[PDB]
Every structure is written in C-alpha cells, then in structure tokens.
Amino acid sequence: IIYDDLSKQAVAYRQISLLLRRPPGREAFPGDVFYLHSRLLERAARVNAEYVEAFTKGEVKGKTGSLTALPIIETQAGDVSAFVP
Amino acid sequence: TGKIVQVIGAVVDVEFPQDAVPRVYDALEVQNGNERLVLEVQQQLGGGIVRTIAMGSSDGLRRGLDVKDLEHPIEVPVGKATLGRIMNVLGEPVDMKGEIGEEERWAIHRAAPSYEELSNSQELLETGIKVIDLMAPFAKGGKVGLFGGAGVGKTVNMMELIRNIAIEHSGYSVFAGVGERTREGNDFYHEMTDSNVIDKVSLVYGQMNEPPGNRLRVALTGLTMAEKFRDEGRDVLLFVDNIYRYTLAGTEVSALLGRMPSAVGYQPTLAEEMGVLQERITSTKTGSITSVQAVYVPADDLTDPSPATTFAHLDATVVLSRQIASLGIYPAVDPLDSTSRQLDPLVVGQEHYDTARGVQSILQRYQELKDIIAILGMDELSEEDKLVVARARKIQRFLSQPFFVAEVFTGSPGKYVSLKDTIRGFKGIMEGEYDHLPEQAFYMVGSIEEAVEKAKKL
Amino acid sequence: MATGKIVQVIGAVVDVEFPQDAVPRVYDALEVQNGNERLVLEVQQQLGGGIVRTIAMGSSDGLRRGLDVKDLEHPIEVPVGKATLGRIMNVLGEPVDMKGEIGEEERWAIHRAAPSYEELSNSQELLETGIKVIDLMAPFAKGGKVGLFGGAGVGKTVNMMELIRNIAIEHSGYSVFAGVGERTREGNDFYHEMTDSNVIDKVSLVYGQMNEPPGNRLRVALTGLTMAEKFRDEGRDVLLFVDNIYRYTLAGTEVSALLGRMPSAVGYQPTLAEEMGVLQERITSTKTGSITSVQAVYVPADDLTDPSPATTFAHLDATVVLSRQIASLGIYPAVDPLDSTSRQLDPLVVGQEHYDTARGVQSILQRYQELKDIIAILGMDELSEEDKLVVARARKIQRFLSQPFFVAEVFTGSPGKYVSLKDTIRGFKGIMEGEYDHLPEQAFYMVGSIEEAVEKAKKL
Amino acid sequence: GVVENLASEQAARMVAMKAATDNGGSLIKELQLVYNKARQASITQELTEIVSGAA
Numbered sequence A: 001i002i003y004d005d006l007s008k009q010a011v012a013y014r015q016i017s018l019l020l021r022r023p024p025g026r027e028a029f030p031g032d033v034f035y036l037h038s039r040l041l042e043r044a045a046r047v048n049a050e051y052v053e054a055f056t057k058g059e060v061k062g063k064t065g066s067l068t069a070l071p072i073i074e075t076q077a078g079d080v081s082a083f084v085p
Numbered sequence B: 001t002g003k004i005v006q007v008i009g010a011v012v013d014v015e016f017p018q019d020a021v022p023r024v025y026d027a028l029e030v031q032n033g034n035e036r037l038v039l040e041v042q043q044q045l046g047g048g049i050v051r052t053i054a055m056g057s058s059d060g061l062r063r064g065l066d067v068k069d070l071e072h073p074i075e076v077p078v079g080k081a082t083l084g085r086i087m088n089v090l091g092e093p094v095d096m097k098g099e100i101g102e103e104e105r106w107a108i109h110r111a112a113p114s115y116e117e118l119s120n121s122q123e124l125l126e127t128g129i130k131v132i133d134l135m136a137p138f139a140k141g142g143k144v145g146l147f148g149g150a151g152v153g154k155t156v157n158m159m160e161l162i163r164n165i166a167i168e169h170s171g172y173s174v175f176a177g178v179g180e181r182t183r184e185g186n187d188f189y190h191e192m193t194d195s196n197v198i199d200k201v202s203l204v205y206g207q208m209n210e211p212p213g214n215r216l217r218v219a220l221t222g223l224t225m226a227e228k229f230r231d232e233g234r235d236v237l238l239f240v241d242n243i244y245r246y247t248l249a250g251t252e253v254s255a256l257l258g259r260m261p262s263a264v265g266y267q268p269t270l271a272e273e274m275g276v277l278q279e280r281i282t283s284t285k286t287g288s289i290t291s292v293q294a295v296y297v298p299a300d301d302l303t304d305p306s307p308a309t310t311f312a313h314l315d316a317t318v319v320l321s322r323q324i325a326s327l328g329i330y331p332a333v334d335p336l337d338s339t340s341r342q343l344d345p346l347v348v349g350q351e352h353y354d355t356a357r358g359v360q361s362i363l364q365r366y367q368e369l370k371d372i373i374a375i376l377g378m379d380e381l382s383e384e385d386k387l388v389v390a391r392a393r394k395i396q397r398f399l400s401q402p403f404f405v406a407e408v409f410t411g412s413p414g415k416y417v418s419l420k421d422t423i424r425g426f427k428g429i430m431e432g433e434y435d436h437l438p439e440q441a442f443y444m445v446g447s448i449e450e451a452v453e454k455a456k457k458l
Numbered sequence C: 001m002a003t004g005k006i007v008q009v010i011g012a013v014v015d016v017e018f019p020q021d022a023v024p025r026v027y028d029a030l031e032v033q034n035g036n037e038r039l040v041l042e043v044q045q046q047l048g049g050g051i052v053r054t055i056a057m058g059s060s061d062g063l064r065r066g067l068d069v070k071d072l073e074h075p076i077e078v079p080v081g082k083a084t085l086g087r088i089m090n091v092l093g094e095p096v097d098m099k100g101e102i103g104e105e106e107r108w109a110i111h112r113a114a115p116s117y118e119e120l121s122n123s124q125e126l127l128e129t130g131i132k133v134i135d136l137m138a139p140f141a142k143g144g145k146v147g148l149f150g151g152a153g154v155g156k157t158v159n160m161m162e163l164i165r166n167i168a169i170e171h172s173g174y175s176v177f178a179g180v181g182e183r184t185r186e187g188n189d190f191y192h193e194m195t196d197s198n199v200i201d202k203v204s205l206v207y208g209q210m211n212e213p214p215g216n217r218l219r220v221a222l223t224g225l226t227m228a229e230k231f232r233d234e235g236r237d238v239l240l241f242v243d244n245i246y247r248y249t250l251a252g253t254e255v256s257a258l259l260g261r262m263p264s265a266v267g268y269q270p271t272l273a274e275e276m277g278v279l280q281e282r283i284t285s286t287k288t289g290s291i292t293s294v295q296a297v298y299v300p301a302d303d304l305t306d307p308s309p310a311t312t313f314a315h316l317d318a319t320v321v322l323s324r325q326i327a328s329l330g331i332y333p334a335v336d337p338l339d340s341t342s343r344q345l346d347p348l349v350v351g352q353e354h355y356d357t358a359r360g361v362q363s364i365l366q367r368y369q370e371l372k373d374i375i376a377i378l379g380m381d382e383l384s385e386e387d388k389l390v391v392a393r394a395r396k397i398q399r400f401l402s403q404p405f406f407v408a409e410v411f412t413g414s415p416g417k418y419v420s421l422k423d424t425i426r427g428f429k430g431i432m433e434g435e436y437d438h439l440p441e442q443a444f445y446m447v448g449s450i451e452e453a454v455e456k457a458k459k460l
Numbered sequence D: 001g002v003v004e005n006l007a008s009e010q011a012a013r014m015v016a017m018k019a020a021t022d023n024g025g026s027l028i029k030e031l032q033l034v035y036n037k038a039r040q041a042s043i044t045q046e047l048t049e050i051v052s053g054a055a
Ligand SMILES: Nc1ncnc2c1ncn2[C@@H]1O[C@H](COP(=O)(O)OP(=O)(O)OP(=O)(O)O)[C@@H](O)[C@H]1O
Pocket: B149, B150, B151, B152, B153, B154, B155, B156, B157, B296, B330, B331, B401, B403, B406, B409, B410
C-alpha cells in the first residue's frame, strides 16, 4: 500500500479538530496527531502462520500474510526536523 | 448499577446512585458487544456523575449501557509467576501460553518510598561503551536517560546496555514497552527466547497501536512488577522503552478530561504526572532498581517542556544528536551536553576526571573555532588553533564504536572496551602521542591499539 | 449605615451587591472590616444589577462572602499641600513614617482630568544636568518630561540619584518622589539620604512597594501626581520623580484578567495605551506652573519593541536609553548616544555650536559601528587609513562619554566628577579634531573633563 | 623572485575571497530558513494564548 501525502491527511485532521474547538498543540496540530498516524501505520505487518490459520478458521495453513506500506511525507525547505516528519 | 451518559473519544462518563459513587482510580466493567471493557475512574463530578478513561477501544459503546462497579483498583500479577512472560497493561497474559500462576496481585497506583527509606550508592557500573562511561558513567542503583530525536539511536543504545549490563548482572529484570513499535517487541522477545535468557525477564507491552489509556498506565504496570522484586530484597534492572509516550497519552486525554491547556498545549498537570511516576523508580535500603529510560525529544527541541522536566529526574543523562548521527559517527552522543552525577573526582578518581574534563575543554574550543573556519577556512587559524582542531577531530572519531547489536547494519564485528583502555586512549591522544595518524585511523575502532593497526593500512 | 455585601472574592478582585437604587459610581471608594483592620475597595465596573467589581487596596486574606460594605460617596482622596512635605505616605495618603498625623487642610481626589488644550505652555528653557552624555546628546528643558529607559541592572536608579543630587538640591522649590513598585530597601536608603543631607523638608514621598497588593501599585502613581498638581496649581515650579512607570502598567495587567477583559498583544490588557495616556497627560506644565519630571522606564529583556516601553516613548520630550550592551563593558553611565535623543536638540535652542558638536559625534559613532563589523572577522588592516583613524577617534569618544558619579563611589571607589556644558562641548570637539589623537583609549575611561584625560594618560 | 611572489599573493587572495564570498552566501540562506521557522512559530504561539485567554 502507498499512502500519498500523509501530510495532507494531517492537515485535514487539523481542520476537523479545530472546527471541533479542540486545543491545538505544537504548530496547530492536536496532541492526537501522533495517534492518527501510528494507529494507521502499525497495521502494516507480517503475521505468522498461526495467526493466518486462526483468522481463516483453518482454511489456509502454513502461509504467512503480509502488508508493506510506503507512506509519503512532504518537507518544507528540506526541513526534516518539523513536527509531522 | 451505573449508566453510561457520555462517550467522547477515550473518555466515558458514568452516572451512579449517589449513595454508591465509585472512588477515584476504581476499576469499572462494561460489556461492549462481544467483549468486556474495563474503565478507570479519573474524577468525581457532581450529582453522582463520574468521569473515566477506557482501557481499550471505546467504539461501539452506546449511551445507556449498564456499568458494573468493581470495588478495587486495577491490580496486576507480581512475583516470579510473571518471569519469562509478556503481559498486558491489565496484567493479562499476551503470549499464547496459559494463565499466569499468580499468588498475589498488586494495585498499580502506589505511594513512593519515604525519605527515610532511600539509600545512597557509589558503585560504578561498567559499560562496553567508550563515550558513555568516560563522559557520563553511572552507578548500580542509579537512573540513566537516553535523550534523542526521531531515528538518532535511542533503541540501539539501550540494546547494547541490555547486552552488556543485563547478562553480567545476575538478578531479575523488567522491560516495559511504552508506546513503541510492535515489531521491536516481537524481535526482542525472540532473541531472548533464542538466547534462553527470557526466563529472567518480565515484559510489559503497551505499544503505539494501543488506545491512550493503555499507553498511559502500562508504565505503572511495569513499575509495580519491579517494585515487587525490589521489596523482595533483590537487585533489579528496569528498562523503559519510551517514557515520552506516558506524557503524550496524558496530553491526548487531558482536554477531554476538561482541563485548560498549558504552555505548548500540554496538560497543566505535566510535572506532577511525571514526578509521581518517576519517584517510584528508586533504589532503597531493602533492595535496588537500576533504570535505563529512553526519552524521545519532539522536533529535536530539547527545550520543550517534556524533555525539560525529565532532566531533573535522572542521575546520568546521555544526549544523542542528529547532527552527529548524520556524520555517521555512532553512538551519536553529544559529549558537551551529556553529563553525570558520578563524574566527580571522589568517586571516579582523578585520572578519569582529568581526562573527561580535558576532552570536554578541547571539544568546546573546537566549537568556538568552527564559526571562524566556516567563513574564512582553516588556513587563517593560528598554529596552536590548528593543533586543537587536529586533535579534536581525532577525538570525535575515537568516540565512535562498533556495537554487537549493530552488526546487522555495519557488518563489522562489535567491540567491548574497558574503562582502563578508554581513559588511556583519550589521555594518549590529548598528550599528542598519536598526532602522526590520520583521522580515519580512529573511526569505528574498539581500542587505541586497533587504531594503530588500522593506520598501517590507512 | 453599610448597604452592600461581598458576593465573590477571587484573588485581589471583590464583587459587592448593593441595592438597585444606590449603586456606587465608578472609582468610588468603599469600606469593609477585614477582621480588625479596615480595608478600602475601589470600584472599577458596574455590571449586572446592583453588583460592582472592585479592587482591594490591601490584602484580600480573611475576607468572607457576606461582609457588610459601606458606601463612601467620593473617590480616594489624599492630603495635599505643604503638610505633605517631609512625610512618607501610602497610596491612601496615610502616614507610614510613624511621625504622626499629616495635619492637612485640604484633600483632593486622585482621579481628575488633564489640562485643556488652551492651558498648555511651550517654555523650553534649557536645563543643565552636569552629565556629559545627557547635556550634549539629550539636553533637558524646564517643564519637560524625561525618560530613562533600560532593562534590569543598567543604571536607571543611580542616574536618577545623580539627577536628584544635581538639579533637585539646586532647584529651590518643592519636589515629589513617587516610589511606584519600588524595592523597600532602596526607598529606605533614599529617605535616609535625603534626611542626612538635610533636604527632606523640601520633598514629599509617596511609596508603593512591591510587596503591596496589586491594587496599591495600580494607584500609587496617581497619588504622587495629585500632590504635584496641587503645587503646580499654587503656581510653584516642582520636580516630579517616578521610580518606575512600567510597574503601574504591570499592575494593570495583573487585575485586567480578573476584571474579565480579553487579552491583547504580548498578553497586555487591551486598555494599555488608554491607561498610559490618562496618567501621562496630567504631567504637563501649564500657564500657571511647571512640572519637570524624570521617569525611569523598565524595558523587559531590553526589548525596546515591547508594547509597554514602545508606547511610553511617544509621551516624553527627552529620552535616554541605557543599554546592557554598553553596560556589559562596565562603561557607566551606559547611555547609548545613537538612540538617546531630545526635542531640545536643534539649533534654535541649543545654538549651532552645540548642534554641530552633537551631530558630529553621532556621525562618527555611526560610522564606527559599521567598521567594527569588518574588523572582528577580517581584522583592522583591511581598512583605509582614514577608516582606521575614525575607528581610533570613535573608540576614544566612546570612552570619553563615561563619567564617575558621586553617588556611585561605593561601587567605584573613586571621586565623582561634575562638568559644565561649556567644558563638555570643548572636549568632544577636541577628540573630533587632532588635539588628542595621541592619547590611548584607556586614558579616557571614567575620567572627567578632557583637561584631566591627559593626566590619566601620563599615569596609565 | 620578490615580484613574482607578490603576483602569487594577489592570485591566492583573489581565490580565498571567492571562497569567503560563497561561504558567506551559504550561511545567509541557512540563517534565513532558521529565522522563518522562528517567525512562524511565534505567531502560532501567541494566537494560541490569545484564544486560550478568551476562556
Ligand atoms: N551504533 C550504531 N551503529 C550503526 N547504526 C546505528 C547505531 N545507532 C543507531 N544506528 C542507526 O540509527 C537507526 C535508528 O536507530 P534506533 O532504531 O535505535 O532509533 P530509535 O531509538 O528507534 O529512534 P525512534 O525510537 O525515535 O524511532 C538505525 O538504522 C540504526 O542503524
């Protein structure tokens, strides 16, 4: 999976968050902004065959499932040190 | 008995009959679809309303659900039954193995030891690592903090400390994963089981996928296990995978708890929430805890409130710099910012103390010259100023070291360096014995003898 | 009879509910028993029905919801005139020197409107201070307003003590000293200084020290103005000294949030320019009498951008800026010539002789500040020999503006110097031309006249 | 030899001033990216204070 411009997801959680009056943190993102991306990304994983067997209800056996992820972020002026990066 | 009356993100309000209102920090229980959800009580509002944080996902909660009042706090298994096992914040088993053979459960909310109970100790603990025990050595029973930004090396450093300390140490250990990567929890567990050292280690994991209530209280689950082993009279090692996540999970809930924002939007309670956690991690006349904590530094801003508050809590502080790491000098320790309570002539003795202050003085003077060099170039320097630079650059390389856990990145084999070899090497460089070698001779060599053998082949 | 009741106490701010037909006017005083002690409140706002929001002129500690409040149908009134002289009073005009009752014949409200446009005067008679950098760069006039700007620890107090010594003893007329937000130690040392030098009978002091509740510091400056306005309206010429104008604005900031106002700017009260203007516009010299005033101005972190110092600059006539950048070198008085200025520095007052000398000194120090940037990186050899010469004679003039004060001997250990304006002009001309090209820089530092800088060179 | 070394001094200084000019031009742009971060951050802080103080 490729996610293009997770920077633009972040900018649109700030809009929803600020329209709901939630206190902004660093820059203007909410404190929840780390939970936004980490809950998203932590789902990309390789799972052992015992998990695949349990999920499939034994229909698939001995195969390890996987999901690679390539998130894209955009830096202003090449600044790697900003909050969302 | 109770009714849910609001659900706002992680926060759930519950109404009770006014004769029956739960105490603060009581556990509640509610059926959420096909699973059981625990809630922890944070505040008593008026009128029998009580405000609580969900220890799990709050989606699918309706208003009007019946809530059950447990008469006690969150209580977790403790003792040897926890050794070799992976546990939830709630102290549930998270490995596929059976139930935990508990004999006792302890509440995770506890008071710190009294001022009379505390104990001093000056036993220097050796590490494999040239920069750390030269510049910021630390004692058995002390606290160490690794400060750094994103991707600078906090975890690789803590994995060498686990390798060096926690396998020449003989007692039990606790590793608390707090808001970090689930992959790295699985990777660590397998190398413990493959090495058959797992049976000495307790692992509590509340990684970054977990909802805020898990990330906040998993730190306290981790300490409560370590406090059982300490009060039993043991010497214990506690590793905390990222202390910053404890504070951040407080920030996430604090607005929903109805608290006005402070400073850079932190919770107003930031220093108390950190302080009550930190004061429990202390060695005592009954037994000892040695602690290593990683401390994420948001946006590399060491003046942000959360790093700043953490600095007063700790006995040795090692600061990792992105600017050094991008040189590829590893460990990326900044020796002008790293410091320890133990760098004192009485405990270290004079030869170590003089070598550390010499290195600090030369490297400071090199910072003072770099703004000259940046515009004019080096040729404008004085011939002594050129010698300070020519030494300082060697010193910066010799601070580098191959780690045994880093072989999967560097390939070249890891080195363990004695304190006698480290002070001898830097003292020799500053005396100028080695001013005929090139800078590359010093990069990534274990000991000063290894530098001269590298220099023969340049 | 007492006719209102306290209905909230939050910090320094107390709300009182009166009957709907006898509500206190704005700025009326109110009175309540805080146990044994009588406490005064000043009405700030009328809000809702019958309720008034007030600032306590004293500690809120021990107030209860429910206490009966008396309505005094006048604002805070203070004793004025000759009875005040040689006395120390608080904001309420009560004696705090133990000497007994003030013994007044008249009392005036501290709140009053400024002089009307028709009453003002422009009598810019030049006034000599005896301080080289002030008399050259920022000449005073009688009846003007002078500000001493600077951050913490730069010399505002000892400059004001020097100005008090030189003009205020010579003045032959009454003086008022307002200790707004001052340190209690320094207010004591000033009182003994005036007593031991035996001039205290000319001067009346109003003191509102820091420890005092925010209400007191908010109003103590108006008590000082009201005494000075009584002597002006008599037709006397008076000197008014203010310990720190900034601390009046800061006391306004403290209460402003509790008075329910939304914040502005760098967290200042929204009314900042109105509150400054309403105080400053009373300190003026009318056709009946003149008030000459010297005000110290705290500059937070030496940032002259900050709204409180930036706003006051418009109300003054001479402004002296004391800089930590100079003070770091120890070269007191630490007056910056390139930022200090006066309305009186033009040829139609100063004459061309003085005007040309001051503009000359400014041009040289301006040029040298650019040259100093080249030197620090490239070195001095990269200059023209004429730019080297300007760097020399500028770096001398920078030291020659220094002068030891005989209120600073305790710091220096050395004898203080006074200079005439005539001798000051001649000295700067002499450095601007060749006469002293051959003396070292250290031969100027904390010297006195040019006529003795040659002597330190011979000693150096 | 004296004259030919003097010609070499002026040549070596010409090149050294090229580097000093490019180095100075390289620093100015890094100081400007650093300033625009501070310029933006301080605006963003003080509006968080003004809105928070309008409780
Ligand atoms: N001693 C070392 N030798 C080689 N590489 C290293 C060393 N220390 C760190 N690095 C490199 O830095 C990268 C990240 O380090 P590490 O994973 O320890 O950071 P981290 O603590 O996880 O940072 P964060 O927790 O913010 O993600 C890894 O690629 C690692 O190879």
